[PDB]
Amino acid sequence: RPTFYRQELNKTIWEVPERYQNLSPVGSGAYGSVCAAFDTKTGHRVAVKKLSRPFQSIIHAKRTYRELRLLKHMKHENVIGLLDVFTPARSLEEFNDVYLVTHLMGADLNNIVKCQKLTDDHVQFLIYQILRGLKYIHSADIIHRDLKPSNLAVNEDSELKILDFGLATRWYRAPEIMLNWMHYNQTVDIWSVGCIMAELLTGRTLFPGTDHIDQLKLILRLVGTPGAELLKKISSESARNYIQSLAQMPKMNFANVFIGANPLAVDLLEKMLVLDSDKRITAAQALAHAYFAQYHDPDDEPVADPYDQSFESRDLLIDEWKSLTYDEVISFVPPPL
């Protein structure tokens, strides 16, 4: 249906619907190159990403499909959504290029945290929105695994969206995935949320480790060494023995570490930053914590539709991966705006 027009930007052809005007490069990452544009239909500024060599191998073809499937599925106020996806190809035989369109995201959360204490009311609202987003994501059996301030967009009204899905810094990474304990669940992302919240409250990174070793030491300084209960849940003897080497450390009183902070905030942090992922608070549980009393509404914290991930275990040829992606592109329907 739409008319396409072609132009040179950077060192390649961009061929996009005429609704998108005034394209100008903003950057280019490992996966794709990104242009800002003006959408004349909706009247918004947008980001147009052209994927790089999406079907170069089976690894990359499966990656393209995986990401497109997830981006299409995610429909929630606190999670990046897909405005449009298109190809200039008029058939599968001519299919090569894939373009993703999203809202032009403003500053990330680091920009807001200029090494200063945010007000408690500000922290409440930001952390509420992250957890609300995570509840949705986790309900689709997805784990982020690399949640950090730079993966969080915030606009002028303090409205927050989670930018990536985890398809530089280890400061926010849960220890059970650092140390390869093979004892983890979705609460790996909750650890990250705890690190982010603490930083927002103090203005300082909670565990600024210089390397893997120093990271662990800093963590155990605050939360204490693992108890026998957790030791026997860790599978590998290497990880088990490595923990048994380090000397015993008491769990610290968080109220002394976060002096002056809302006592409800301290209590939530204590539930977030525990080593045993079987005892770590989940997103749904954290939303019901008294800290978020003013924001919490169970009927306005939705879960995702069931998410079919059976493709992960299939072994297909490269043309099949490309064919499946093509299907997802041409059958795309914009969200009801």
Numbering used by the authors: 5 to 171, 184 to 353
The publication says:
p38α, also known as MAPK14, is a ubiquitously expressed mitogen-activated protein kinase (MAPK) family member that has a key role in maintaining cellular homeostasis and tissue organization. The p38α structure is topologically similar to other MAPKs and consists of two lobes linked by a flexible hinge, with the junction between the two lobes forming the ATP binding site. The activation of p38α normally involves phosphorylation by the upstream kinases MKK3 and MKK6, but p38α can be also activated by non-canonical mechanisms that involve autophosphorylation. Here, we report the identification of p38α inhibitors referred to as NC-p38i, which efficiently inhibit the autophosphorylation of p38α while having a minor effect on the canonical p38α pathway.
To characterize at an atomic level the interaction between NC-p38i and non-phosphorylated p38α, we performed co-crystallization experiments with either compound NC-37 or NC-38 and with or without the ATP competitive inhibitor SB203580 or the slow hydrolyzable ATP analog ATP-γ-S. Both SB203580 and ATP-γ-S have been reported to bind to p38α facilitating its crystallization. As for p38α, we used a recombinant protein that contains the single point mutation C162S, which facilitates crystallization by reducing its aggregation. We obtained well-diffracting crystals for three complexes of p38α with NC-37 or NC-38, two in the absence of co-factors and one with SB203580 bound to the ATP binding site. In the absence of SB203580, the NC-p38i molecules occupy the active site, forming an extensive network of contacts independently of the presence or absence of the fluorine atom. The amino acids involved in the interactions were very similar in both compounds, with residues V30, A51, K53, L104, T106, L108, M109, L167, and D168 forming the cavity that accommodates the ligands. All the solved structures were unphosphorylated, with the DFG motif at the beginning of the activation loop in the active conformation (DFG-in). We observed that the Asp side chain of the DFG motif was oriented towards the ATP binding site and participated in direct interactions with the compounds. Interestingly, this hydrogen bond was absent in our three structures, and the helix comprising residues 182–188 (where T185 is located) was also poorly formed. Therefore, the absence of this short helix and the hydrogen bond probably contributes to the selective inhibition of p38α autophosphorylation observed upon NC-p38i binding. Intriguingly, we only observed Y35-out orientations in the complexes of p38α with NC-p38i molecules, suggesting that this conformation is the most favorable to enable access of NC-p38i to the active site of p38α.
